[PDB]
Amino acid sequence: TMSVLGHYNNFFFAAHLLDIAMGFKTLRTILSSVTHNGKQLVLTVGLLAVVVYLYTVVAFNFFRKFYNKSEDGDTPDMKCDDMLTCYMFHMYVGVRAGGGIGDEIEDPAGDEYEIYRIIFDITFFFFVIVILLAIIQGLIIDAFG
Amino acid sequence: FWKKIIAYQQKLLNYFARNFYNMRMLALFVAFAINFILLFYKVSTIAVHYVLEESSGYMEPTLRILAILHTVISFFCIIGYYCLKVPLVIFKREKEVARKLEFDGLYITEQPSEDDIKGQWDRLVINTQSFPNNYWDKFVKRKVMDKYGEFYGRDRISELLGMDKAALDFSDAREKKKPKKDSSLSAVLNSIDVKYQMWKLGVVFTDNSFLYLAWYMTMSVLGHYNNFFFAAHLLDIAMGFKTLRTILSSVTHNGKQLVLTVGLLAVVVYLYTVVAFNFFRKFYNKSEDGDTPDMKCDDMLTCYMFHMYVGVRAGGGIGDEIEDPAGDEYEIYRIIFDITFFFFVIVILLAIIQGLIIDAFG
Amino acid sequence: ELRDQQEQVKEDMETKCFICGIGNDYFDTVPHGFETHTLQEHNLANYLFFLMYLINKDETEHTGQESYVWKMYQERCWEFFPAGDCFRKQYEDQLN
Amino acid sequence: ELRDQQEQVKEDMETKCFICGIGNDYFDTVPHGFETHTLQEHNLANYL
Amino acid sequence: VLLTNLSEHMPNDTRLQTFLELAESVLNYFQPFLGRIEIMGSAKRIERVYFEISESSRTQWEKPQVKESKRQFIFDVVNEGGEKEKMELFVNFCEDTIFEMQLAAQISESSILTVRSALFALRYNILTLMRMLSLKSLKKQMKKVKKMTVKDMVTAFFSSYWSIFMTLLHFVASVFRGFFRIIC
Ligand SMILES: Nc1ncnc2c1ncn2[C@@H]1O[C@H](COP(=O)(O)OP(=O)(O)OP(=O)(O)O)[C@@H](O)[C@H]1O
Ligand SMILES: Nc1ncnc2c1ncn2[C@@H]1O[C@H](COP(=O)(O)OP(=O)(O)OP(=O)(O)O)[C@@H](O)[C@H]1O
Ligand SMILES: O=c1[nH]c(=O)c2nc[nH]c2[nH]1
Ligand SMILES: [Ca+2]
Ligand SMILES: [Zn+2]
Ligand SMILES: [Zn+2]
């Protein structure tokens, strides 16, 4: 089906380049590593989702005012006004921030919730970045090993 | 009539004990549904009126019904746990207290260590008339009497254990008894013991699972006041699944060394903060505009803030967010400072905490 | 590896005794056999107490075994110490 | 694994001799039994 | 010591055990002082040795200056102790411990409130639970519900357990108040 669809659109032929993984034993091991521990992997992804949801709820209830992401001052980009968009802003771009959600959020210095913000972002950095991501990583690499 | 209260009460208790597990499952599903309903929540623009935006238009009545149903199902889970697992814990503790009473003489030959809440609490159950209520024979009292009474003293050992030798002789002698009446409430009140109910409810409160279920209780009733407290019930999935249980217990398993490593990280960050406070203050300006400065390391409390928060999370050491030290007379000292921070704080002790946790899990 | 070495040392104590090195498996046939072998049969504290008893006792009053051990100790000969053996192993055929 | 193989080789020397492969446990009954078995009884240098 | 020697070299003979039961108290008293080791005999047989252990030497043994030193000695010998180095190091440590215990003898010269507030909270709260039975207000509800109504019965039972949960909350609050009083 991939070949006959590649006749219609030549870019479908790129899917056939996945056949190298079938061809070589090492690539077969790498691809099967995901499925081997994939059950615990799905559970860990769910736990990460749970933790990100809890942090999103906390920021929604208390830390909305910091979630402006608009460079210009005339129009605001109010990210955590809707919890769906706030859960977006956490899942996408806070897990990938590399130093917690505190990097892209505006600086909490001088606010009356300063210490609460610091604890929030530090606990996010630990539980989400340092923890559960190393857990997924180690699960996959240990299945391969 | 009283036959019928007893019958229907026992029927309800047996039903709840039989269905306690599936009913915890239904409570978890109700919590998940409530959280999914809350997913579509919204703020409206000064009192900020939190209004639940509804795509279909039927979310808020369903949320109300599911909140009430969650409370009811969780309360009945309390009932089911009390009917099912509480008597087993009571029987186990009764067995332990009877065995240390007889074989070891924990309260006759010796005394409780006085640092053990278990022993201090079980001191009360000894004199209760409902002793082994659930532990088979009620003759362990007589056995301890025979074993230790004559050695230490019959009268006051009988006072301690709760019997008298008059009843012991009356056991062998002729006896006349008046059977109890279910109609008489005072008879049941005399039958139930204040000290035994004391001990039983204290043990039940000491039980950890009952404490978890009471936490679930309080979270639900507070979720009625504020619907967002229902999100705490979504932590029950970790209790539900074994793998999540392992993940949550991984923190506690190596948590002692983990606390020590966190303290060592604190010590190292404090030393670096002191060094930067004494020497490297001039670089700690974090104000983009030049008119007003944001002088972070002027106060060491704020400087320790600026290290702990945002230097450990910098990903490349405190040198990333600090201004560039090029051209300063302390240039090499600054370079060594930031490189050693990157190694000891980022590369080291953070990999150590990470490895400790993941290795506990493994 | 430092953690592993510490745990290795601890479980080596738990498995085998220091004096003669016989593992706990042999003593485990009888209840608390290894524990007994540690506190009375093969006790580091007991051996040190014997050493101080030899030092504090007069040369005239030494018994036969005491004088034998004292002579071997002075000459720095450690053969009197059991090596992979004990009273239980030595008299297993009669005792058990 | 390279480090582990090097340590494996070293401790295999320490446990057993090359010529006949009998582990040190048998020789260990007498003092320095394995050492003696290595330098005079079974010595690679002596065989060469 | 003589009785112990006879008993250990002859466990079978019952008369010796009879003497042992006759002398249990003496042996029990002398057990801490009695020393027992196994040595390689001069006649190629393992022989048990019995000796006296002084109480002062024992006390010096439980003193921590012994304890840290023997921690270190065990940790060293288990790791880097050879077949023969193990035993020579044991003897050397024995002599060093002898010296340091002599030094120790020379230098030597010659939650309650938590349990108890918890008891108060539990007694108070359970007594408040039974204050309803003391007021005796269940007999009137009884007389109203002489008739047969499972709905009223389940409501009444749920109310009683409802207040048992309320009682649990009062207990938690009392524990929290006690904790505050102690921390302040
Ligand atoms: N030869 C032995 N001599 C003494 N203890 C031994 C011996 N072999 C094994 N053990 C074990 O070692 C423990 C006692 O010895 P050791 O003093 O090293 O340990 P410990 O529990 O830390 O003691 P302490 O609390 O007195 O410091 C016991 O668990 C005992 O079973
Ligand atoms: N069959 C054997 N022949 C020689 N040495 C052996 C043998 N079996 C074990 N060994 C051990 O190997 C060591 C000596 O052999 P080898 O030359 O391999 O090691 P080494 O200590 O690096 O020697 P050198 O210092 O001479 O280079 C000793 O520790 C010895 O106990
Ligand atoms: O020795 C006994 N132990 C028990 O637990 C028991 N239960 C009933 N009858 C019993 N007898
Ligand atoms: Ca003589
Ligand atoms: Zn031994
Ligand atoms: Zn050989």
DSSP state of B321: T
* B51-61: b (≥16 Cβ within 10 Å) or e: eeebeeeebee
| Spatial distance between the Cα atoms of B190 and B176, rounded to a whole number of angstroms | 19
List phi, psi (to 5°) of E49. Answer: -120, 135
* Backbone gaps in chain E, preceding residues (C–N over 2.5 A): 110
CB A99 within 8 A of CB A125: yes
Tokens representing B223 are: 């979720």
Q: Ligand 6 centre and the CA of C26: distance in Å?
A: 29
Sign of the four-CA dihedral A9, A12, A16, A17: positive
Instruction: Report DSSP letters for D10-39, one per residue.
Output: HHHHHHB-TTT--BHHHHTTSTTHHHHIII
E and C interact (at least 3 Cβ pairs within 8 A): yes
Listed resolution, Å: 3.7
> Residue D4: how many CA atoms within 13 Å on its side-chain side?
2
Angle at Cα B108 formed by Cα B107 and Cα B110, nearest 5°?
70
Tokens representing E153 are: 């019965």
Tokens representing B59 are: 């979310």
Which of E119, E134, E144 to substitute to test the interface with B, most B CBs within 10 Å? E119
List phi, psi (to 5°) of E63. Answer: -65, 145
**Collapsed DSSP state (helix, strand, coil) of residue A78:** strand
Closest residue by CA, ligand 2 atom 5: D38
Distance from CA of C30 to the nearest CA of E (A): 15
Q: Give Cα B161 distance to the centre of its chain.
A: 34
> Residue B38: how many CA atoms within 13 Å on its side-chain side?
26
Comparing CA positions, the residue from B232, B237, B195 lying closest to residue B217 is B232
How far from each other are the two terminal CA atoms of chain C, in whole angstroms? 42
CB B60 within 8 A of CB B52: yes
In total, the C-beta contacts within 8 angstroms joining chain A to chain B are 68
Q: Where are the alpha helices (DSSP H) in chain A?
A: 2-8, 19-23, 25-36, 38-61, 83-94, 114-124, 133-144
Longest dimension (CA), chain D: 35
Query: Which residues on C lie below 8 Å from E27 (Cβ)?
Result: none
Residue B19: how many other CB atoms lie within 10 Å: 16
**Burial of C54: CB neighbours in 10 Å, binned 0-12, 13-18, 19+:** middle
Hey, what long-range contacts does E84-88 have (CB within 8 A, 24 or more apart)? E84/C78, E84/D31, E84/D32, E86/C18, E87/C78, E87/C81, E88/C76, E88/C78
List phi, psi (to 5°) of D7. Answer: -65, -35
Strand partners, D16: D23
The answer to whether D28 contacts E83, with C-beta atoms less than 8 Å apart, is: yes
A38-61 vs A133-144: helix crossing angle, rounded to 10: 170
E29 to B4, B198, C36, E25, E34: CA distances (angstroms): 66, 44, 19, 6, 9
Tokens representing B315 are: 């990903």
Which of C87, C88, C92, C93 to substitute to test the interface with E, most E CBs within 10 Å? C87
C18 to A130, C4, C41, E74, E96: CA distances (angstroms): 43, 20, 12, 9, 18
State if residue E22 touches ligand 1 by the CB under 6 angstroms criterion.
Answer: no
Distance from CA of A95 to the nearest CA of B (A): 13
**Collapsed DSSP state (helix, strand, coil) of residue B100:** helix
Pairing between strand B42-44 and B49-51?
A: antiparallel
CB A103 within 8 A of CB A97: yes
Comparing CA positions, the residue from A38, A39, A45, A56 lying closest to residue A105 is A56
How far from each other are the two terminal CA atoms of chain E, in whole angstroms? 60
A7 to A2, A4, A13, A20: CA distances (angstroms): 9, 5, 8, 21
Which helix (H) or strand (E) is B42 found in, with range?
strand B42-44
Q: Where are the alpha helices (DSSP H) in chain B?
A: 2-18, 20-38, 59-84, 86-102, 117-122, 140-152, 154-161, 165-172, 185-191, 194-206, 208-225, 236-240, 242-253, 255-278, 300-311, 331-341, 350-361
**Burial of B262: CB neighbours in 10 Å, binned 0-12, 13-18, 19+:** middle
The answer to whether E84 contacts D28, with C-beta atoms less than 8 Å apart, is: no
| Spatial distance between the Cα atoms of A19 and D3, rounded to a whole number of angstroms | 36
| Spatial distance between the Cα atoms of B18 and B265, rounded to a whole number of angstroms | 51
Query: Which residues on E lie below 8 Å from C85 (Cβ)?
Result: 40, 46
State if residue D44 touches ligand 2 by the CB under 6 angstroms criterion.
Answer: yes
* D3-28: b (≥16 Cβ within 10 Å) or e: eeeeeeeeeeeeebbeeeeeebeebb
The residue written with tokens 């400087």 in the block is: B303
| Spatial distance between the Cα atoms of E20 and C8, rounded to a whole number of angstroms | 42
Instruction: Report DSSP letters for C48-68, one per residue.
Output: HHHHHHHHHS-STT--HHHHH
| Spatial distance between the Cα atoms of B345 and B342, rounded to a whole number of angstroms | 6
Q: Tell me the helices (H) and strands (E) count for chain C, helix number first.
A: 7, 0
Q: Ligand 2 centre and the CA of B32: distance in Å?
A: 68
Residue B255: how many other CB atoms lie within 10 Å: 15
Query: Which residues on B lie below 8 Å from A102 (Cβ)?
Result: 309-310, 313
Q: Which amino acid is at C25?
A: D
C and A interact (at least 3 Cβ pairs within 8 A): no
| Spatial distance between the Cα atoms of B361 and B350, rounded to a whole number of angstroms | 17
State if residue D19 touches ligand 2 by the CB under 6 angstroms criterion.
Answer: yes
B63 to B28, B37, B223: CA distances (angstroms): 15, 7, 11
CB B113 within 8 A of CB B119: yes
Angle at Cα B123 formed by Cα B118 and Cα B125, nearest 5°?
100
Comparing CA positions, the residue from B142, B135, B180 lying closest to residue B158 is B142
CB A104 within 8 A of CB A93: yes
The contacts of residue B333 (CB under 8 Å, 6+ apart) are B279, B280
Comparing CA positions, the residue from A140, A59, A133, A72 lying closest to residue A102 is A59
| Spatial distance between the Cα atoms of B33 and B26, rounded to a whole number of angstroms | 10
Q: Give Cα B136 distance to the centre of its chain.
A: 32
| Spatial distance between the Cα atoms of B122 and B108, rounded to a whole number of angstroms | 13
The answer to whether E35 contacts C49, with C-beta atoms less than 8 Å apart, is: yes
| Spatial distance between the Cα atoms of C82 and E46, rounded to a whole number of angstroms | 7
CB E70 within 8 A of CB E49: no
Q: Which amino acid is at B34?
A: I
